[PDB]
């Protein structure tokens, strides 16, 4: 464990869980997703858990919070996973994000980023140089 990331996992969880049990369930996960404009059903939510859960309990707990913590950091350049994040980084569904739905995403997910903060992130993934982020750019940034 890195001191720099000594309690990051806790930081995120601190904003997800609510019932003080410290495990994000189906209904808990749903709200976070719903706040971004997405409104799916139980099958869509439970399917997500199965995406992380590997103990057969059907709920993301602590081990999965360490295992998938690495998995995703290695399985970043896969295929649809690049579209996945792009899907959670967009709301209007147009193909690109800027000082638009980005701010809304962070405020409803769990990341501090003021205008000048996201501005950095703009020139961070603005390969094409139009002051924006899109599929074509994110794919390259998501690995390089």
């Amino acid at each position: 464990l890195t001191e720099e990331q000594i309690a990051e996992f806790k930081e995120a969880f601190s904003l997800f869980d609510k019932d003080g049990d410290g495990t994000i369930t189906t209904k808990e996960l749903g709200t976070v997703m719903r706040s971004l404009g997405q409104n799916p059903t139980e099958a869509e939510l439970q399917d997500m858990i199965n995406e992380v859960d590997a103990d057969g309990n059907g709920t993301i707990d602590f081990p999965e919070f360490l295992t998938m913590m690495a998995r995703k950091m290695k399985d970043t350049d896969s295929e649809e996973e690049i579209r996945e994040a792009f899907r959670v980084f967009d709301k209007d569904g147009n193909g690109y994000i800027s000082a638009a739905e980005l701010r809304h995403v962070m405020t409803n997910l769990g990341e501090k980023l003021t205008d000048e903060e996201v501005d950095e992130m703009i020139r961070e993934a603005d390969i094409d140089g139009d002051g924006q982020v899109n599929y074509e750019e994110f794919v390259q940034m998501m690995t390089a």
Partner: peptide
């Protein structure tokens, strides 16, 4: 879905410039 997107968000943020 939020747990993995969070990690990806961190990987997209933590590059060199911004933290």
């Amino acid at each position: 879905m939020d747990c993995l997107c969070i990690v990806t968000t961190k990987k997209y943020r933590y590059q060199d410039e911004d933290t």
